Amino acid sequence: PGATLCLGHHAVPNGTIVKTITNDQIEVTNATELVQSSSTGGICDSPHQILDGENCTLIDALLGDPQCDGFQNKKWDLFVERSKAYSNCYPYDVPDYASLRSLVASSGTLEFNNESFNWAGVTQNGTSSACKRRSNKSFFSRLNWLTHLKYKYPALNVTMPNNEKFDKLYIWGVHHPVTDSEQISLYAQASGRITVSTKRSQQTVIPNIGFRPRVRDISSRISIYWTIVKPGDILLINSTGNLIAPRGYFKIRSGKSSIMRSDAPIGKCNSECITPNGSIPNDKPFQNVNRITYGACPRYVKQNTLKLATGMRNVPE
Amino acid sequence: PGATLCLGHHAVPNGTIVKTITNDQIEVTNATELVQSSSTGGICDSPHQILDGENCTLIDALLGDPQCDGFQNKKWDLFVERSKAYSNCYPYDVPDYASLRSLVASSGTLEFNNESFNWAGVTQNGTSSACKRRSNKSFFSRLNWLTHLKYKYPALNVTMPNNEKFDKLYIWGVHHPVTDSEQISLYAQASGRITVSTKRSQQTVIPNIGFRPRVRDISSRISIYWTIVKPGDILLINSTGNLIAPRGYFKIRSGKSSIMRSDAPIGKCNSECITPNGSIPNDKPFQNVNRITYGACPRYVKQNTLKLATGMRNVPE
Amino acid sequence: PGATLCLGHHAVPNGTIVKTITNDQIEVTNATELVQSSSTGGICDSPHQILDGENCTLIDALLGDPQCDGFQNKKWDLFVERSKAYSNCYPYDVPDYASLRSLVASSGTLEFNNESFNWAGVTQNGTSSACKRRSNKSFFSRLNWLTHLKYKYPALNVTMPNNEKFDKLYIWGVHHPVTDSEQISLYAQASGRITVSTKRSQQTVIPNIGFRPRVRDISSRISIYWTIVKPGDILLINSTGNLIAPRGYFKIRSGKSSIMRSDAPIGKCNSECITPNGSIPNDKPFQNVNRITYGACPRYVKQNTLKLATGMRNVPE
Ligand SMILES: *[C@@H]1O[C@H](CO)[C@@H](O[C@@H]2O[C@H](CO)[C@@H](O[C@@H]3O[C@H](CO)[C@@H](O)[C@H](O[C@H]4O[C@H](CO)[C@@H](O)[C@H](O)[C@@H]4O)[C@@H]3O)[C@H](O)[C@H]2NC(C)=O)[C@H](O)[C@H]1NC(C)=O
Ligand SMILES: *[C@@H]1O[C@H](CO)[C@@H](O[C@@H]2O[C@H](CO)[C@@H](O[C@@H]3O[C@H](CO)[C@@H](O)[C@H](O[C@H]4O[C@H](CO)[C@@H](O)[C@H](O)[C@@H]4O)[C@@H]3O)[C@H](O)[C@H]2NC(C)=O)[C@H](O)[C@H]1NC(C)=O
Ligand SMILES: *[C@@H]1O[C@H](CO)[C@@H](O[C@@H]2O[C@H](CO)[C@@H](O[C@@H]3O[C@H](CO)[C@@H](O)[C@H](O[C@H]4O[C@H](CO)[C@@H](O)[C@H](O)[C@@H]4O)[C@@H]3O)[C@H](O)[C@H]2NC(C)=O)[C@H](O)[C@H]1NC(C)=O
Ligand SMILES: *[C@@H]1O[C@H](CO)[C@@H](O[C@@H]2O[C@H](CO)[C@@H](O[C@@H]3O[C@H](CO)[C@@H](O)[C@H](O)[C@@H]3O)[C@H](O)[C@H]2NC(C)=O)[C@H](O)[C@H]1NC(C)=O
Ligand SMILES: *[C@@H]1O[C@H](CO)[C@@H](O[C@@H]2O[C@H](CO)[C@@H](O[C@@H]3O[C@H](CO)[C@@H](O)[C@H](O)[C@@H]3O)[C@H](O)[C@H]2NC(C)=O)[C@H](O)[C@H]1NC(C)=O
Ligand SMILES: *[C@@H]1O[C@H](CO)[C@@H](O[C@@H]2O[C@H](CO)[C@@H](O[C@@H]3O[C@H](CO)[C@@H](O)[C@H](O)[C@@H]3O)[C@H](O)[C@H]2NC(C)=O)[C@H](O)[C@H]1NC(C)=O
Ligand SMILES: *[C@@H]1O[C@H](CO)[C@@H](O[C@@H]2O[C@H](CO)[C@@H](O[C@@H]3O[C@H](CO)[C@@H](O)[C@H](O)[C@@H]3O)[C@H](O)[C@H]2NC(C)=O)[C@H](O)[C@H]1NC(C)=O
Ligand SMILES: *[C@@H]1O[C@H](CO)[C@@H](O[C@@H]2O[C@H](CO)[C@@H](O[C@@H]3O[C@H](CO)[C@@H](O)[C@H](O)[C@@H]3O)[C@H](O)[C@H]2NC(C)=O)[C@H](O)[C@H]1NC(C)=O
Ligand SMILES: *[C@@H]1O[C@H](CO)[C@@H](O[C@@H]2O[C@H](CO)[C@@H](O[C@@H]3O[C@H](CO)[C@@H](O)[C@H](O)[C@@H]3O)[C@H](O)[C@H]2NC(C)=O)[C@H](O)[C@H]1NC(C)=O
Ligand SMILES: *[C@@H]1O[C@H](CO)[C@@H](O[C@@H]2O[C@H](CO)[C@@H](O)[C@H](O)[C@H]2NC(C)=O)[C@H](O)[C@H]1NC(C)=O
Ligand SMILES: *[C@@H]1O[C@H](CO)[C@@H](O[C@@H]2O[C@H](CO)[C@@H](O)[C@H](O)[C@H]2NC(C)=O)[C@H](O)[C@H]1NC(C)=O
Ligand SMILES: *[C@@H]1O[C@H](CO)[C@@H](O[C@@H]2O[C@H](CO)[C@@H](O)[C@H](O)[C@H]2NC(C)=O)[C@H](O)[C@H]1NC(C)=O
Ligand SMILES: *[C@@H]1O[C@H](CO)[C@@H](O)[C@H](O)[C@H]1NC(C)=O
Ligand SMILES: *[C@@H]1O[C@H](CO)[C@@H](O)[C@H](O)[C@H]1NC(C)=O
Ligand SMILES: *[C@@H]1O[C@H](CO)[C@@H](O)[C@H](O)[C@H]1NC(C)=O
Ligand SMILES: *[C@@H]1O[C@H](CO)[C@@H](O)[C@H](O)[C@H]1NC(C)=O
Ligand SMILES: *[C@@H]1O[C@H](CO)[C@@H](O)[C@H](O)[C@H]1NC(C)=O
Ligand SMILES: *[C@@H]1O[C@H](CO)[C@@H](O)[C@H](O)[C@H]1NC(C)=O
Ligand SMILES: *[C@@H]1O[C@H](CO)[C@@H](O)[C@H](O)[C@H]1NC(C)=O
Ligand SMILES: *[C@@H]1O[C@H](CO)[C@@H](O)[C@H](O)[C@H]1NC(C)=O
Ligand SMILES: *[C@@H]1O[C@H](CO)[C@@H](O)[C@H](O)[C@H]1NC(C)=O
């Protein structure tokens, strides 16, 4: 009679369909998903240092909008900007806004150091009812609105050397009055001009008098500029009116900091990968949650699923 | 005696050479080409909506050059700009020309809506012999050349609210006269200035008096600017001379529209993929016709041929 | 008794570990390295035409700094800029510096042709003690500092047609005096203005009077501009003061030229691939020396080694 000896392999009742080079649908015994397609919905506060902007854009926190005083000198790995954020100070613009936002975001600090600028012969600390703190007239915390002193505004020609080891970031502005009479009222002369320089750079800005649509009841504007001063270089501000003066400098660092627009709530939890939709697990190589990511993240792809076979072809009985 | 039974495979007398991982030349029984290397030479008018610019650049059709009146309010999927196109109006430039061209191309419409601007106290509808229609002096159709009225040009301070659901695109300009006397002749004062603003943006432009080389017998110039006004925002134009005024706004849409530079003839035929050399079939995954494409196109590669084996190794008798 | 016949394969005592799809460490009989990770440390002078900038940036060689006269009319495949380079002329800036540097680098020539500009009614060839040659006061070789003649500076309105087959590159500038009295001293009027135009472009620049920090004992500045003039177009310079005039044009070519920042010494040797660290062999497909390359180079990757098996699995006795 003898014997029979059969060689074989396993199978399962519940196989999974995968793609191959020669067939778009072949059943295997098991597979694993390579695309992360879900988020928790919240941004985990760990292990990156998260700073929720709340009502403040980064730029408003930089300048010192009345609603942003709690942000002074804070650092972040990721600054989270909310869609509801709005300004509540003097109406302003920033030529190149995107670049200033980017460079501050990347620096990852609002560390500010006051300096003693000699603003000889003018009135300091101007305020406005468009920028209140506690119902008092106020202004951006990091800027100094200079006006005439006894109807004189003598030329400013002011120096500030950088004798530090690090670069200094200076934020400053120009005031664009609504009318010729507002110009004379504030600065005691018919126009102004501002030249801000270092040994290696120069910027000059001319105020432009005229009506813009009222924002927080103001038809004038401030335009914001910036200047970086290297170790052993010197900031020189030369102006005859309309200067929104710096009060000091921001530290500028390099590192892994960034900024993200998101309305996701921040949670007490730990996740390396952040998207605007919330944190996502990072076990998988790919993800289809968002092209926008921060941290150790899977790579964004268009597919919502990619199944890797982890078993043989399934050939059921 | 018994029998002989031989297993085998086919071969062909006319095999084709392909590349593999281990050999750059191996003969197989059959192959197919994966690189599209030929075009029809014409651009098929279907199924994309093609607009042939003919003598008009997109920007000339936007502004309303005399040769471009047939383009009013037209839409396109693909605007085709011809190398022979030339201007036949007042000589102009557009700072950022490439961006305005791009944003209009992408919007895919020249839909224009007139608005009733209150140009109080000035002469409207200025014309020039450098911009004729039917031998009459004329001007860009979408712009309004304002000049003095009885040797006065009172300050303009004009508002236009956007109470629509959509964004408005405003095109406007500044006139740069050739001399101080041309300046006084046209505007009744020694210089002008233009500030165009919204709640969230501002642009001011100063005219620059002087000689440029004559183009269509004109040594002055117009410089063209634009402003986008969001729903619930307000356009404000504040000017004292030299304003080339808007007559209304363009609609701005988003969608799949673009622009292509090509001299290929447009034909009555149907092809999904357009290149500057003409339409190409899109059965193949790759193509070497042109890096510039529009529609459902094969991907541009440097190779002029890539043969995919569709049969076994050919081993002839 | 019969015989035994065994089939087998070789092995070696000194195998090498490679990576595969299924195993990160498998020993094979032999392998070859696909990542170039070392350089010679020097840049080979062959076969690309190398121009060592020595003390001169490309822009200083363009303008004609006193230390750069040996560079006149030189050509290069690769201009090598040294970190020690410094300027020794009048302090200047170039708005868009990076673009002018790039376009000259890519052109690959400093070929200069003098032209006879009619600077009627002014003093030519101004010099300064901040820009000495051989202890004499001097100036940039390719620029012409115009000042008043007998306390008059009549308006300049000067033309230069391009009747060549090629494009002309014009370099010119604006002088920004330190004070109102320096302005009057040099130009005999209270301000200047410069409009440089062609049939298809225009640039106007306003001088900005004021103090900048002293560089080589100078608190004023020059700002450098450029203009390209096509065949059959015409350069027109219209100015009333502060013009740093062109002396002629640079040829502008297209080809394979570039610029590299490196402190590597130049050697007498032959290598197709240049990096800032020195030339590297180009037998391998990949390299991890530097992302910055010029010539026929392996592709930059992050890995420092990638071993390709060139033999079977090693199975020692
Ligand atoms: C189908 O194929 C997949 C992929 O092979 C397979 O999934 C794998 O299953 C194993 C076993 O369950 C998982 O191993 C676990 O991994 C987690 C980390 O995420 C560990 O926490 C687990 O630890 C347990 O066991 C340890 C033993 O030392 C203990 O230390 C500890 O107490 C834990 O209880 C464990 O190592 C592995 O993560 C997955 N892999 C993937 C990619 O999902 C799945 O099992 C297969 N299914 C079938 C039906 O065969
Ligand atoms: C070498 O290999 C290639 C690739 O396999 C092979 O080319 C293929 O040939 C087949 C058969 O001729 C083609 O099939 C045709 O495809 C077109 C679409 O482009 C259809 O219009 C054709 O329809 C005909 O037959 C249909 C049957 O139902 C009818 O509906 C109709 O009336 C038509 O007459 C047909 O399906 C196929 O497109 C190509 N593929 C490629 C990539 O070219 C070629 O035949 C092989 N050569 C040899 C000598 O073996
Ligand atoms: C392990 O695998 C590698 C890769 O296969 C293998 O390296 C190769 O070795 C051969 C033989 O030494 C090399 O061939 C030489 O290539 C150089 C060019 O760089 C030539 O100059 C050499 O020419 C000599 O021989 C010629 C014969 O006609 C003569 O013309 C001349 O006089 C020269 O003496 C020769 O062709 C080849 O370059 C390498 N390849 C790589 C990628 O390194 C290595 O030998 C293997 N090791 C073992 C132990 O098996
Ligand atoms: C130039 O044009 C602008 C824009 O039209 C004019 O601005 C407008 O000025 C009026 C008068 O001051 C403003 O009215 C105010 O509205 C607020 C809000 O309801 C109200 O609280 C005040 O009591 C007053 O009614 C109006 O807001 C403002 N509009 C805009 C869009 O800014 C300006 O007056 C013109 N200038 C001249 C000199 O004509
Ligand atoms: C750059 O800084 C300098 C240094 O302060 C400024 O120059 C100075 O400007 C003042 C006032 O504008 C000048 O004084 C005036 O002199 C005239 C002429 O006699 C007189 O009519 C006025 O009543 C007043 O006294 C001063 O002369 C001048 N100093 C120098 C050394 O030139 C300059 O204004 C600053 N630039 C900017 C853009 O602010
Ligand atoms: C400033 O310089 C410019 C450039 O050289 C001068 O422009 C030139 O002006 C002359 C005189 O008007 C123009 O001549 C005209 O040429 C046309 C074309 O053939 C002809 O039809 C007219 O009858 C006349 O001859 C010339 O075209 C023009 N050149 C350029 C390049 O624009 C300008 O005159 C100078 N201004 C002053 C005040 O000197
Ligand atoms: C921005 O829009 C306003 C509103 O029209 C313009 O301000 C107004 O400008 C006019 C004419 O330039 C001023 O009138 C002049 O007053 C002087 C001083 O008495 C007189 O010498 C002139 O004969 C003329 O009457 C008017 O006062 C002024 N209005 C206000 C409220 O300040 C302004 O010009 C516009 N800006 C631009 C850049 O166009
Ligand atoms: C406006 O402010 C600037 C910046 O503080 C002043 O520039 C400074 O001017 C002084 C006086 O000329 C310069 O002093 C010189 O220093 C050199 C170098 O040691 C020395 O050789 C000279 O004998 C003299 O002492 C100083 O270098 C310069 N500083 C900078 C940073 O540029 C300018 O004087 C002010 N203008 C007015 C009108 O007040
Ligand atoms: C653009 O080039 C033209 C052509 O030279 C310049 O225009 C000319 O400028 C001069 C001097 O600025 C003017 O002369 C002056 O006339 C007045 C009025 O009588 C007088 O007070 C002065 O003493 C002097 O004679 C000349 O009239 C004028 N020519 C023309 C045809 O308008 C212009 O200045 C140049 N632009 C720039 C930005 O340099
Ligand atoms: C994560 O958020 C993104 C961004 O909002 C979502 O992507 C959008 O999805 C909507 C459909 O509801 C599309 O209309 C948009 O085109 C997408 N936005 C952009 C900017 O491309 C996405 O659905 C979210 N993913 C998960 C897993 O929650
Ligand atoms: C399609 O048009 C392109 C663009 O003109 C052609 O590519 C050019 O080919 C010429 C040779 O005649 C080269 O000198 C140029 O370098 C190419 N132009 C550019 C801009 O790179 C191409 O030959 C055409 N292809 C087909 C199939 O007609
Ligand atoms: C070639 O030069 C580059 C550039 O300096 C070297 O890369 C740097 O390596 C240092 C470590 O000493 C790092 O701190 C820097 O991040 C690298 N620089 C940049 C700009 O990324 C590299 O080591 C050199 N390679 C060889 C083979 O000599
Ligand atoms: C098949 O069933 C087993 C046991 O319930 C399970 O662990 C495995 O993941 C299933 N296969 C699927 C879901 O494809
Ligand atoms: C943000 O602003 C809203 C009003 O716009 C206010 O209700 C809320 O309390 C503010 N939040 C903070 C943190 O200041
Ligand atoms: C301006 O305000 C600061 C506090 O913000 C104060 O220290 C300083 O003395 C004030 N200076 C003047 C001149 O008012
Ligand atoms: C070989 O000949 C057949 C019959 O003529 C043809 O259909 C096939 O495409 C040919 N092979 C080529 C052109 O490589
Ligand atoms: C375009 O311009 C040329 C003359 O430059 C003319 O012959 C042709 O008819 C014009 N075409 C159209 C459509 O206006
Ligand atoms: C300007 O021209 C338009 C037609 O283009 C006309 O409706 C309008 O009445 C004219 N206005 C003036 C003031 O000439
Ligand atoms: C093994 O030894 C031989 C002979 O010395 C040598 O040629 C070969 O490259 C060696 N293998 C290595 C270094 O992996
Ligand atoms: C470059 O400058 C240094 C001084 O800074 C000098 O020693 C050297 O000789 C100069 N080299 C050349 C080639 O001019
Ligand atoms: C200016 O200098 C050049 C030599 O650099 C000389 O040929 C020319 O004659 C000089 N012109 C004047 C007006 O000084």
Q: What is the CATH number for B84? A: 3.90.209.20
Q: Could you tell me which residues are beta bridge partners of residue C51?
A: C79
Cα–Cα dist C244/C207, whole Å: 11
Nearest C-alpha neighbor of B72 from the set B80, B64, B82, B60: B64
User: Are A93 and B201 inside 8 Å of each other by CB?
Assistant: yes
Cα–Cα dist B131/B123, whole Å: 18
Strand order of the β-sheet with A299-300 is A35-36, A286-287, A299-300
Nearest C-alpha neighbor of C112 from the set C133, C141, C88, C83: C141
Nearest C-alpha neighbor of C52 from the set C88, C87, C78, C73: C78
For chain A, list the contacting chains (3+ Cβ pairs, <8 Å): B, C
Atom from ligand 2 closest to the CA of residue B283? 42
Nearest C-alpha neighbor of A204 from the set C212, C190, C189: C212
Cα–Cα dist C206/B206, whole Å: 11
Q: What is the DSSP letter of A215?
A: B
Nearest C-alpha neighbor of C255 from the set C70, C48, C35: C48
Residue nearest to atom 9 of ligand 19 (CA): C30
Q: What is the DSSP letter of A264?
A: P
Tell me the residues of chain C between 174 and 193 that have a Cβ less than 8 Å away from chain A.
176
3 state DSSP class of A180: helix
> CB of A172 within 8 A of CB of A226?
yes
Strand order of the β-sheet with A202-205 is A156-161, A234-239, A194-197, A202-205
Task: Give burial (CB, 10 Å; 0-12/13-18/19+) of C89.
Answer: buried
Range B180-200 burial, b when 16+ CB lie within 10 A, else e: eeebbebbbbebbbbbbbbbe
Q: What is the DSSP letter of A84?
A: T
Cα–Cα dist C196/A300, whole Å: 49
Task: Select from B159, B202, B238 the Cβ nearest to the Cβ of A221.
Answer: B202
Cα–Cα dist A252/B86, whole Å: 50
Cα–Cα dist C275/C296, whole Å: 11
Q: How was this structure determined?
A: X-ray
What DSSP line would sit under A128-162, residue for residue?
EEEEEETTEEE--TTEEE-EEBTTB-PPEEEEEE-
Domain region containing C132 = 49-264
Cα–Cα dist B295/B256, whole Å: 9
| Cα(C291) to centroid(ligand 12), Å | 10
Query: CB of C30 closer than 6 A to ligand 3?
Result: yes
Pairing between strand C50-52 and C78-81? parallel
For chain B, list the contacting chains (3+ Cβ pairs, <8 Å): A, C
Cis peptide bond N-terminal to A66, omega within 30: no
User: Are A213 and B202 inside 8 Å of each other by CB?
Assistant: no
Which residues, 6 or more positions from C207, have their beta carbon under 8 angstroms from its beta carbon? Answer: C174, C175, C176, C177, C183, C191, C192, C193, C241, C242
Token pair in block for residue A251? 């530290």
Sign of the CA dihedral with B144 first, then B148, B150, and B155 last: positive
Token pair in block for residue C246? 């062109």
User: Is residue C45 left, alpha or beta, with left meaning phi > 0 and alpha meaning psi from -120 to 50?
Assistant: alpha
Which residues, 6 or more positions from A312, have their beta carbon under 8 angstroms from its beta carbon? Answer: A9, A10, A28, A29
Token pair in block for residue B127? 């014309």
3 state DSSP class of A184: helix
Cis peptide bond N-terminal to B47, omega within 30: yes
Nearest C-alpha neighbor of B53 from the set B258, B248, B240: B258
What DSSP line would sit under chain B, residue for residue?
------------SS-EEE--SS-S-EEES-EEE-EE----SSEEEESS-EEE-TT--HHHHHHT-GGGGGGTT-B-SEEEE-TT----SS-EE-TTHHHHHHHHHHHTB--EEE-----TTEE----EEEEEETTEEE--TTEEE-EEBTTB-PPEEEEEE--SSS-EEEEEEEEE-SSHHHHHHHHSSS---EEEE-SS-EEEE----S----BTTB--EEEEEEEEE-TT-EEEEEESS-EEEE-EEEE---SS-EEEE--PPEEEEE-SEEETTEEE--SSSEE-S-S--EES-PEE-S-S--EEE-SPBP---
> CB of C147 within 8 A of CB of C202?
no
> CB of A171 within 8 A of CB of A110?
no
Sign of the CA dihedral with C173 first, then C178, C183, and C187 last: negative
* Cα–Cα separations (whole angstroms), residue B141 to B137, B217, B259: 12, 20, 22
Query: CB of C54 closer than 6 A to ligand 20?
Result: yes
| Cα(B120) to centroid(ligand 7), Å | 14
Which residues, 6 or more positions from A159, have their beta carbon under 8 angstroms from its beta carbon? Answer: A234, A235, A236, C213
User: Are A204 and C210 inside 8 Å of each other by CB?
Assistant: yes
Nearest C-alpha neighbor of B212 from the set B201, B198, B222: B222
Pairing between strand B168-176 and B243-246? antiparallel
Cα–Cα dist B233/B167, whole Å: 9
Nearest C-alpha neighbor of B204 from the set B169, B236, B246, B164: B236
Nearest chain C Cα to A206, which residue? C208
Cα–Cα dist A250/A109, whole Å: 8
Q: Could you tell me which residues are beta bridge partners of residue C112?
A: C250
Task: Select from A93, A210, A215 the Cβ nearest to the Cβ of B195.
Answer: A210
| Cα(C262) to centroid(ligand 12), Å | 12
Q: For the beta carbon of residue C161, count every other beta carbon within 10 angstroms.
A: 13
Q: Which amino acid is at C195?
A: T
Task: Give burial (CB, 10 Å; 0-12/13-18/19+) of A22.
Answer: exposed
Which residues, 6 or more positions from B2, have their beta carbon under 8 angstroms from its beta carbon? Answer: none
Angle (nearest 5°) at CA C158 between C155 and C164: 170
Q: For the beta carbon of residue C316, count every other beta carbon within 10 angstroms.
A: 10
Q: Which amino acid is at A5?
A: L
> CB of A213 within 8 A of CB of B199?
yes
> CB of C72 within 8 A of CB of C112?
yes
Nearest C-alpha neighbor of B262 from the set B39, B15, B72, B1: B39
Cα–Cα dist A91/B246, whole Å: 26
Cα–Cα dist B67/B244, whole Å: 20
Q: What is the DSSP letter of C155?
A: P
Nearest C-alpha neighbor of B60 from the set B144, B131, B166: B131
Strand order of the β-sheet with A278-280 is A278-280, A273-275, A294-295
A208 in contact with B, Cβ within 8 Å: yes
| Cα(A33) to centroid(ligand 10), Å | 21
Residues of C in contact with B21 (CB under 8 A): none
Range C118-153 burial, b when 16+ CB lie within 10 A, else e: ebeebeeebebebbbeeeeebbbbbbbbbbbeeeeb
Q: How far separated are the first and last CA of chain B, in Å rounded?
A: 27
Q: How far separated are the first and last CA of chain A, in Å rounded?
A: 27
- Per DSSP (E only), the strands in A53-145 are 78-81, 92-93, 112-114, 122-123, 128-133, 136-138, 143-145
Only one residue has tokens 């100094």, namely: A144
Q: For the beta carbon of residue A154, count every other beta carbon within 10 angstroms.
A: 12
Q: Which ligand is nearest to the CA of A314?
A: 13
Cα–Cα dist C10/C4, whole Å: 19
Element holding C122 (H helix, E strand): strand C122-123
Residues of B in contact with A208 (CB under 8 A): 193, 195, 202, 204
| Cα(C221) to centroid(ligand 5), Å | 18
Nearest chain A Cα to B206, which residue? A208
Cα–Cα dist B140/B246, whole Å: 10
Range C15-44 burial, b when 16+ CB lie within 10 A, else e: bbebeeeeeeeebbbbbeebbbeebeebbb
For chain C, list the contacting chains (3+ Cβ pairs, <8 Å): A, B
User: Are A221 and B234 inside 8 Å of each other by CB?
Assistant: no
Q: For the beta carbon of residue A248, count every other beta carbon within 10 angstroms.
A: 16
Token pair in block for residue C13? 């005592």
